[PDB]
Amino acid sequence: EEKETIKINNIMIAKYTVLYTSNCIMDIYSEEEKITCFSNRLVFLERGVNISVRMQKQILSEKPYVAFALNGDMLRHLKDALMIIYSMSRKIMTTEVNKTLLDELKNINSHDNSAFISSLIYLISKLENNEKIIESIYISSVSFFSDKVRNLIEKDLSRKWTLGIIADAFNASEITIRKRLESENTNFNQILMQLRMSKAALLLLENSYQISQISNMIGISSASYFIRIFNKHYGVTPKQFFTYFK
Amino acid sequence: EKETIKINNIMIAKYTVLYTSNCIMDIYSEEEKITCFSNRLVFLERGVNISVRMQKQILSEKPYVAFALNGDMLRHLKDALMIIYGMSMSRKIMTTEVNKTLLDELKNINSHDNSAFISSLIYLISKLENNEKIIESIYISSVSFFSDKVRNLIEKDLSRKWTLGIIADAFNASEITIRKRLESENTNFNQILMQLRMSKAALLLLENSYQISQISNMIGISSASYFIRIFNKHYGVTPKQFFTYFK
């Protein structure tokens, strides 16, 4: 039982994410591809990918990594600025971090949005072959139809949603909905489960809600059911997940 | 001695960032006065006319480092700044202290790569306190006023014998329209034409690969000796003195 190592399935990258592997080695698998992120690297994750991850911590007492997830505004603006300025391998990218680059990582302030975008802009100008990055930021700024489905469901995550309700709200047929979600490699039940499990993951890391509270917040009747669903979904228990990232 | 120079009627043709790497500088413009010490960054709004008194710290070296943005650079930088932040003399000329880490960014600037260069400026601006006056001046200096239109018409043939009639014809307007539109911006036609010819002459001189006689014919002035008189009258220093100071 290696506390320094964990394997997690069905990770959805909800926001475009920049990740610095401050305390881990990370193997990312998705679609039979494999990307290794070594120690002390910057990692760029396209918004919307589902990945499995194998993580190895060098030091147990700290978090595996440091991440920067960009909200909806931040992303689009960053697309806007990047345009005015300028397969999995094109969705996930790792780079080594300099003292100059890392020092800017150190100063990033999540509150000052302008300051944050300028920092990211600076960081991207310094990278070799930065088009792969510019593509994913731009690609992951367009809202697909499943984003629309997601946004409808996020408003009331506790509701008993159905493919009927969704197709009604879109003035379309059920087959239109599922076939449109098929063209984006997902389906309605996957979106809903992936939304509840993403939220639950974040709620767990806050350490200020009980499991039964968490399940009720994401709309699941029983705490013991939620724990079973979480383990089936991620491949670890809520407890195991929390201890690794705590 | 001769390490100090005073130059009059400098027009900031492009928006300019200037690092006073080797000088102290007094800037007089709009009947105001701004002292920039050694090791400061200076932000100069496009279109200001200034007079400068400079004192070099080290005689053998050039007085300062400058970055002038052409039209593309400027508007692109405006576009990005508006996307990132949203939509009197003190607000046109601004000097700031630059950190050592930021100083390395001064060192890091490469003028040949546009994308890299704009990003760095955005980074430099985010790191500054009260950077709205800077954002203001950049945005203010991105619009083309009517005198920019006149300048752009004149630039097509700097040697031509321009007149207010020719200008007014080329705009399908009356001479009164032209002079009164140029008045509402505190300028007139003769001032635009003379400051255009002296800006160009100044830059050709620093190239050191054109003769005075060549330079005078390129900007549209009959004689080399006349051009030398006009340059001295305009800048308050001779072409040789001006060249030697920056050489």
Side-chain angles (χ1 to χ4, degrees), chain B residues 80-91:
Chain B
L81 281 179
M82 295 298 106
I83 284 283
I84 298 168
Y85 297 68
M87 179 63 84
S88 179
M89 161 82 154
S90 63
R91 306 204 160 172

PDB file of all heavy atoms in Angstrom, chain B residues 80-91:
ATOM      1  N   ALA B  80      -4.995  44.505 -27.006  1.00  0.00           N
ATOM      2  CA  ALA B  80      -4.756  43.591 -25.898  1.00  0.00           C
ATOM      3  C   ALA B  80      -5.039  44.252 -24.554  1.00  0.00           C
ATOM      4  O   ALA B  80      -5.664  43.641 -23.681  1.00  0.00           O
ATOM      5  CB  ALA B  80      -3.322  43.069 -25.957  1.00  0.00           C
ATOM      6  N   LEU B  81      -4.583  45.491 -24.357  1.00  0.00           N
ATOM      7  CA  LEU B  81      -4.782  46.137 -23.062  1.00  0.00           C
ATOM      8  C   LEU B  81      -6.257  46.341 -22.761  1.00  0.00           C
ATOM      9  O   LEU B  81      -6.689  46.219 -21.607  1.00  0.00           O
ATOM     10  CB  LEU B  81      -4.061  47.479 -23.005  1.00  0.00           C
ATOM     11  CG  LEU B  81      -2.560  47.439 -22.742  1.00  0.00           C
ATOM     12  CD1 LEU B  81      -1.980  48.862 -22.745  1.00  0.00           C
ATOM     13  CD2 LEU B  81      -2.324  46.763 -21.405  1.00  0.00           C
ATOM     14  N   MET B  82      -7.046  46.673 -23.778  1.00  0.00           N
ATOM     15  CA  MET B  82      -8.473  46.848 -23.553  1.00  0.00           C
ATOM     16  C   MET B  82      -9.115  45.507 -23.209  1.00  0.00           C
ATOM     17  O   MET B  82      -9.957  45.426 -22.305  1.00  0.00           O
ATOM     18  CB  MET B  82      -9.114  47.494 -24.791  1.00  0.00           C
ATOM     19  CG  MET B  82      -8.638  48.931 -25.089  1.00  0.00           C
ATOM     20  SD  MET B  82      -8.965  50.199 -23.828  1.00  0.00           S
ATOM     21  CE  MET B  82      -7.350  50.490 -23.074  1.00  0.00           C
ATOM     22  N   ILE B  83      -8.647  44.438 -23.864  1.00  0.00           N
ATOM     23  CA  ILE B  83      -9.127  43.082 -23.625  1.00  0.00           C
ATOM     24  C   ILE B  83      -8.766  42.613 -22.213  1.00  0.00           C
ATOM     25  O   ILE B  83      -9.507  41.838 -21.603  1.00  0.00           O
ATOM     26  CB  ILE B  83      -8.516  42.147 -24.692  1.00  0.00           C
ATOM     27  CG1 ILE B  83      -9.193  42.300 -26.061  1.00  0.00           C
ATOM     28  CG2 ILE B  83      -8.554  40.690 -24.240  1.00  0.00           C
ATOM     29  CD1 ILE B  83     -10.542  41.643 -26.213  1.00  0.00           C
ATOM     30  N   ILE B  84      -7.637  43.072 -21.673  1.00  0.00           N
ATOM     31  CA  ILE B  84      -7.172  42.642 -20.357  1.00  0.00           C
ATOM     32  C   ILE B  84      -7.712  43.501 -19.216  1.00  0.00           C
ATOM     33  O   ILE B  84      -7.927  42.992 -18.111  1.00  0.00           O
ATOM     34  CB  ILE B  84      -5.638  42.603 -20.344  1.00  0.00           C
ATOM     35  CG1 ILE B  84      -5.134  41.586 -21.367  1.00  0.00           C
ATOM     36  CG2 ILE B  84      -5.127  42.192 -18.983  1.00  0.00           C
ATOM     37  CD1 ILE B  84      -3.652  41.693 -21.632  1.00  0.00           C
ATOM     38  N   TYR B  85      -7.910  44.799 -19.439  1.00  0.00           N
ATOM     39  CA  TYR B  85      -8.286  45.727 -18.375  1.00  0.00           C
ATOM     40  C   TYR B  85      -9.664  46.360 -18.539  1.00  0.00           C
ATOM     41  O   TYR B  85     -10.165  46.935 -17.565  1.00  0.00           O
ATOM     42  CB  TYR B  85      -7.239  46.854 -18.242  1.00  0.00           C
ATOM     43  CG  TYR B  85      -5.853  46.354 -17.840  1.00  0.00           C
ATOM     44  CD1 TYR B  85      -5.092  45.587 -18.721  1.00  0.00           C
ATOM     45  CD2 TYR B  85      -5.297  46.655 -16.590  1.00  0.00           C
ATOM     46  CE1 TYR B  85      -3.833  45.110 -18.376  1.00  0.00           C
ATOM     47  CE2 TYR B  85      -4.015  46.187 -16.237  1.00  0.00           C
ATOM     48  CZ  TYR B  85      -3.293  45.408 -17.144  1.00  0.00           C
ATOM     49  OH  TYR B  85      -2.036  44.912 -16.849  1.00  0.00           O
ATOM     50  N   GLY B  86     -10.292  46.272 -19.722  1.00  0.00           N
ATOM     51  CA  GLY B  86     -11.583  46.897 -19.988  1.00  0.00           C
ATOM     52  C   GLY B  86     -11.462  48.265 -20.655  1.00  0.00           C
ATOM     53  O   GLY B  86     -10.370  48.796 -20.894  1.00  0.00           O
ATOM     54  N   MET B  87     -12.626  48.843 -20.963  1.00  0.00           N
ATOM     55  CA  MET B  87     -12.666  50.184 -21.561  1.00  0.00           C
ATOM     56  C   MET B  87     -12.932  51.278 -20.523  1.00  0.00           C
ATOM     57  O   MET B  87     -12.516  52.429 -20.695  1.00  0.00           O
ATOM     58  CB  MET B  87     -13.720  50.244 -22.670  1.00  0.00           C
ATOM     59  CG  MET B  87     -13.851  51.617 -23.344  1.00  0.00           C
ATOM     60  SD  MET B  87     -12.375  52.211 -24.216  1.00  0.00           S
ATOM     61  CE  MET B  87     -12.556  51.400 -25.806  1.00  0.00           C
ATOM     62  N   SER B  88      -3.508  66.962 -20.074  1.00  0.00           N
ATOM     63  CA  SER B  88      -2.549  67.435 -19.078  1.00  0.00           C
ATOM     64  C   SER B  88      -1.203  66.703 -19.190  1.00  0.00           C
ATOM     65  O   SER B  88      -1.142  65.516 -19.516  1.00  0.00           O
ATOM     66  CB  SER B  88      -3.115  67.277 -17.662  1.00  0.00           C
ATOM     67  OG  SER B  88      -2.185  67.703 -16.675  1.00  0.00           O
ATOM     68  N   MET B  89      -0.120  67.437 -18.939  1.00  0.00           N
ATOM     69  CA  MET B  89       1.219  66.898 -19.162  1.00  0.00           C
ATOM     70  C   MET B  89       1.543  65.718 -18.256  1.00  0.00           C
ATOM     71  O   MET B  89       2.217  64.768 -18.680  1.00  0.00           O
ATOM     72  CB  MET B  89       2.234  67.996 -18.938  1.00  0.00           C
ATOM     73  CG  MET B  89       3.607  67.511 -18.706  1.00  0.00           C
ATOM     74  SD  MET B  89       4.386  67.140 -20.256  1.00  0.00           S
ATOM     75  CE  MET B  89       6.109  67.380 -19.753  1.00  0.00           C
ATOM     76  N   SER B  90       1.102  65.773 -16.997  1.00  0.00           N
ATOM     77  CA  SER B  90       1.407  64.714 -16.037  1.00  0.00           C
ATOM     78  C   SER B  90       0.976  63.350 -16.542  1.00  0.00           C
ATOM     79  O   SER B  90       1.541  62.328 -16.137  1.00  0.00           O
ATOM     80  CB  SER B  90       0.699  64.999 -14.714  1.00  0.00           C
ATOM     81  OG  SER B  90      -0.712  64.984 -14.904  1.00  0.00           O
ATOM     82  N   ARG B  91      -0.021  63.323 -17.422  1.00  0.00           N
ATOM     83  CA  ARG B  91      -0.579  62.108 -17.998  1.00  0.00           C
ATOM     84  C   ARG B  91       0.017  61.733 -19.340  1.00  0.00           C
ATOM     85  O   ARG B  91      -0.401  60.723 -19.912  1.00  0.00           O
ATOM     86  CB  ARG B  91      -2.087  62.281 -18.190  1.00  0.00           C
ATOM     87  CG  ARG B  91      -2.844  62.688 -16.946  1.00  0.00           C
ATOM     88  CD  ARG B  91      -4.279  62.264 -17.080  1.00  0.00           C
ATOM     89  NE  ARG B  91      -4.963  62.186 -15.800  1.00  0.00           N
ATOM     90  CZ  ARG B  91      -6.267  61.993 -15.679  1.00  0.00           C
ATOM     91  NH1 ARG B  91      -7.048  61.887 -16.743  1.00  0.00           N
ATOM     92  NH2 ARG B  91      -6.801  61.901 -14.463  1.00  0.00           N
TER      93      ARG B  91
END
